[PDB]
Amino acid sequence: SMYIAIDGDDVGRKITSSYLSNSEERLTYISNKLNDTTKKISKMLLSNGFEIIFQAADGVTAKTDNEVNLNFVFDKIKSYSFDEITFSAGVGANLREAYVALLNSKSNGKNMISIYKDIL
Amino acid sequence: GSMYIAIDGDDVGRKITSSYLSNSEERLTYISNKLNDTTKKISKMLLSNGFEIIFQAADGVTAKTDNVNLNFVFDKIKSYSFDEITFSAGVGANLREAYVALLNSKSNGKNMISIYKDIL
Amino acid sequence: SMYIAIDGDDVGRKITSSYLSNSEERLTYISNKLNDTTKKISKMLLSNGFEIIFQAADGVTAKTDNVNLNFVFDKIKSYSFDEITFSAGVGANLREAYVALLNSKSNGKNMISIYKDIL
Amino acid sequence: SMYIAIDGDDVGRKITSSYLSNSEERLTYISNKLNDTTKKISKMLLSNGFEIIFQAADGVTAKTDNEVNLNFVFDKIKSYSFDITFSAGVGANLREAYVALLNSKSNGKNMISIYKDIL
Ligand SMILES: Nc1ncnc2c1ncn2[C@@H]1O[C@H](COP(=O)(O)CP(=O)(O)OP(=O)(O)O)[C@@H](O)[C@H]1O
Ligand SMILES: [Mg+2]
Ligand SMILES: [Mg+2]
Ligand SMILES: [Mg+2]
Ligand SMILES: [Mg+2]
Ligand SMILES: [Mg+2]
Ligand SMILES: [Mg+2]
Ligand SMILES: [Mg+2]
Ligand SMILES: [Mg+2]
C-alpha cells in the first residue's frame, strides 16, 4: 500500500493578498483555479490506480496497492501548477508517513516530492 | 453600500492533521466530505439572503451583499457546525475589513463573528 | 537518548489579539512573560539532567541520557500563564519528538505525547 | 507616533527541516543565529530612538515619536539577514503596523509596507 499527500505551496499568501488589496476578482480566480487544479490531480491519480481519500482546499490524498511511477505521477502534478503556485507531495506506507513526508517537502524548498523511507 | 463577510472554519487543520498522525482514513475522508457539504450549505444560505458568493473553497466562504441580520446569518452558519468544528465570521465594508475582522474573531477565542467598525 | 520538544499553545493568536486591539501593555507582557517562562522551563530541565538544545520563542527542546517525565511535564503545565499553555512531544530522536509535538498540538492542547505511544 | 512590526520570513521551514532530519546542529545554529539577529535588530532600533515593545521569537516591534528614515532602518534590517529575510509593517498604532506586516508577508516578503500606502 502506498499513500501520497499533495498540497498547494504557499496558497494562503495569494488569498491573503487578494483580501488586503480588496480584489474580488483575484480572490475568485484563485478559488476557481484551485478547485479546478485539485480536480485534475484527483482524476490523474484515479487514472493511475489511486483511491482518493481526501480532496479539499488545495490538497489531495490518495492510496494504491498497484505499481506506480512516482516520477511520472509527480511530473504530472508539476504540470498542473498555475501562476507561481506549485505543489509538494509526500509518499509513505501509511497516512502518517505520507504526512511526515509532505512536511519534509514543504520545509526543504517545496515543489518537490519526499518519500518517507528516504527521510530516515 | 456593499457589505462583505468572510466565513472560515475554526481549527480545521488540527482535526485533519490528527487524522493523518493516527492513520484514520475514516476520520479523514469524513472531514473532507462534511467540509464540502458544510460550505455548500453556507453559500446556499447566503444566496437565499441576498448575498453574492465571492469564494467557496477549502473550509471558508466569502460573499458580499448590497442589502441583513447578522445574528440570523451567523446562527445559520453556526447551526451547520459538525463534530468539533465551529466557524468564525468577519464583516466589513470591503474585503480588507472583512478579513481583519475574521482575524479578530479567530484571535479572541473562536466560534464568533466580528464587525470591523467594532474593533477600531 | 530521550528528546523533548516543548512549545506554547496558540501563542500567535494572543499576540495578534494584542495587535488588533492596540494593547501595547499586553503585547509587551506576552513578550516578557514568554521569555521568562522558557527560561524557567530550561533551568527546570537542566535540574532534571537535561541538556538544552533549543530555548527561544515559545518553546524549549532538549535531550537526556539519564527522568521523571510525569513530574517534568507537570511543572510544564504549571508554568502556563494567562491564556497560554504548553504542549510537549517525546521521542528517541528529534524527528520523533517533533512528530509527537504535532500530535499533542492536533489533539487538543496542554498535553504531552510519546512517539512510541502514537504508533 | 510610529509603530513598526518586524518578523522573519519562513523561519519555521528551516526549523522543521532540522527536526525531520535529526540535525541538532542545524537546529542549534538556527535558534542561536536568529536570537542574535533580533537583538541586532533591537539595538539598531534603539540607536534610532525606538522604544522596544516586543522582542521574542523572530519578531521585533517598537515605536517612536521622532521622524525616522524608514529606508535606512529597513535597509539595515535587510543587512542582518543570514542564509532568512525579514519583512516589516509600519503604522500609527499596533493594529495598523500589524496589518501592514500582513501585507508584506503576502506580497513577496523581504519588504516593508506602510499602512497609509496600502489603502
Ligand atoms: N529566534 C527564533 N528562535 C527560535 N525559534 C523561532 C525563532 N523565531 C521563530 N521561531 C519560530 O516561532 C514560532 C513560534 O510560534 P508557532 O509555534 O510557530 C505557532 P503558535 O501560535 O505560537 O502555537 P502553535 O504551535 O500551537 O500553533 C515557531 O514556529 C518557531 O519556529
Ligand atoms: Mg498548501
Ligand atoms: Mg492545504
Ligand atoms: Mg479555518
Ligand atoms: Mg480557511
Ligand atoms: Mg506555539
Ligand atoms: Mg513555537
Ligand atoms: Mg516569521
Ligand atoms: Mg514570528
Are B98 and B62 in contact, with CB atoms under 8 Å apart? Answer: yes
Contact A20 D105 (CB under 8 A): no
Exposed / middle / buried, residue D21 (Cβ in 10 Å: 0-12, 13-18, 19+): middle
- The residue whose CA is least distant from atom 26 of ligand 1 is C9
Interacting residues of A118 by C-beta distance below 8 A, sequence separation 6+ = none
Interacting residues of A12 by C-beta distance below 8 A, sequence separation 6+ = D106
Give the separation between CA D22 and CA C98, rounded to whole angstroms.
10
Distance of CA C99 to the CA centre of its chain: 14
Are A55 and A71 in contact, with CB atoms under 8 Å apart? Answer: no
Element (H, E) at C87: strand C86-91
Give the separation between CA A115 and CA A102, rounded to whole angstroms.
9
Residues facing residue D1 across a β-bridge? none
Distance from CA of A120 to the nearest CA of B (A): 17
The backbone torsions φ and ψ at residue B83, rounded to the nearest 5 degrees and listed phi first, read 55, -135
What length does chain D have?
Answer: 119
Give the separation between CA D48 and CA A1, rounded to whole angstroms.
60
List the 84-113 stretch of D: residues with Cβ below 8 A of B.
Answer: 95, 99
Give the separation between CA C48 and CA C64, rounded to whole angstroms.
9
The 3-class secondary structure across chain D, one letter per residue, is CEEEEEEECCHHHHHHHHHHCCCHHHHHHHHHHHHHHHHHHHHHHHHCCCEEEEEECCEEEEEECCCCCHHHHHHHHHHCCCCCCEEEEEECCHHHHHHHHHHHHCCCCCCEEEHHHHC
Give the separation between CA A106 and CA C68, rounded to whole angstroms.
35
Edge-first strand listing for the sheet containing A87-92: A51-56, A59-64, A2-8, A87-92, A113-115
Q: Report which of C65, C63, C55, C4 is spatially closest to residue C34, judged by C-alpha positions.
A: C55
Are D72 and D4 in contact, with CB atoms under 8 Å apart? Answer: no
3-state SS class at A81: coil
3-state SS class at A51: strand
DSSP states of B18-33 as a string?
HHHHTT-HHHHHHHHH
Distance of CA D41 to the CA centre of its chain: 8
**How many alpha carbons fall within 13 Å on the CB side of residue B54?**
23
Are A9 and A44 in contact, with CB atoms under 8 Å apart? Answer: no
- Counting one residue from chain A and one from chain C, the pairs whose CB atoms sit within 8 A come to 4
Atom of ligand 1 nearest to the CA of D16: 31
Q: How far is the CA of D11 from the centre of ligand 1 (A)?
A: 8
Q: What are chain C's partners, defined as 3 or more CB pairs within 8 angstroms?
A: A, B, D
Nearest to B21 among C13, C16, C106 (CB): C106
Give the separation between CA C19 and CA A51, rounded to whole angstroms.
45
Q: Report which of A96, A93, A104, D94 is spatially closest to residue B20, judged by C-alpha positions.
A: A96
Q: A16-51 burial, b if ≥16 CB within 10 A, otherwise e?
A: bbbbbbbebebbbebbeebbebbeebbebbeeeebe
Give the separation between CA A90 and CA A111, rounded to whole angstroms.
11
Q: Which residues in chain C are closer than 8 Å to D18, comparing Cβ atoms? A: 94
Nearest to B95 among A24, A56, A94 (CB): A24
Is the minimum distance from the CB of D11 to ligand 1 under 6 angstroms? yes
Give the separation between CA B23 and CA C68, rounded to whole angstroms.
30
Are B9 and B71 in contact, with CB atoms under 8 Å apart? Answer: no
Question: What domains, with CATH codes, occur in chain B?
Answer: 3-118 (3.30.70.270)
Does A1 reach chain B within 8 Å, measured CB to CB?
no
Resolution of this entry, Å: 2.4
Cell numbers given for A6: 499533495
Give the separation between CA B74 and CA B80, rounded to whole angstroms.
10
Is the minimum distance from the CB of C105 to ligand 1 under 6 angstroms? yes
Does C31 reach chain B within 8 Å, measured CB to CB?
no
Cell numbers given for B20: 493523518
- Residue of A7, A23, A24, A35 to mutate when probing chain B, most B C-beta within 10 A: A24
